[PDB]
């Protein structure tokens, strides 16, 4: 369900000089850029696409520190325990923060990437 982006990035890999590897990265830097919106001067994120099932998942990166520094964005070494304790201070962790309506907007947002890829491709 919602898996054309796959078939999207296949008909530009047909194209000579045209990689879709790069395509791919596309589709990720709209879907983090469109949610950044959202909270950019508020916190960072790094969102994961998986072209094998067409899926998506957004991850916020906290700075793991013995005590909070950085009031926009940080994560306690305890907290950071609690899910994975092999943590360490100075390292990042990566939490869930996808909405729950995420879902379709992949498709929007790789459909809407994956298209420009096409138009600009013939454009020069």
Not at 19 to 34: D, G, T, V
Not at 42 to 55: I, K, P, Y
């Amino acid at each position: 369900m919602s898996s054309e982006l796959l078939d999207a990035l296949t008909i530009l890999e047909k194209e000579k000089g045209i990689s879709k590897e790069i395509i791919i990265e596309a589709i990720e830097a709209a879907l983090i850029s469109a949610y950044k919106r959202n909270f950019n001067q508020a916190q960072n994120v790094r969102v994961d696409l998986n072209r094998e099932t067409g899926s998506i998942r957004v991850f916020a990166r906290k700075d793991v520190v013995d005590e909070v520094y950085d009031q926009r964005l940080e994560i306690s070494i305890e907290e950071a325990q609690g899910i994975h304790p092999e943590y360490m201070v100075g390292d990042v962790v990566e939490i869930e923060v996808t909405p729950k309506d995420f879902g379709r907007i992949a498709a929007q947002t790789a459909k809407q990437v994956v298209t420009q890829r096409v138009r600009e491709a013939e454009r020069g």
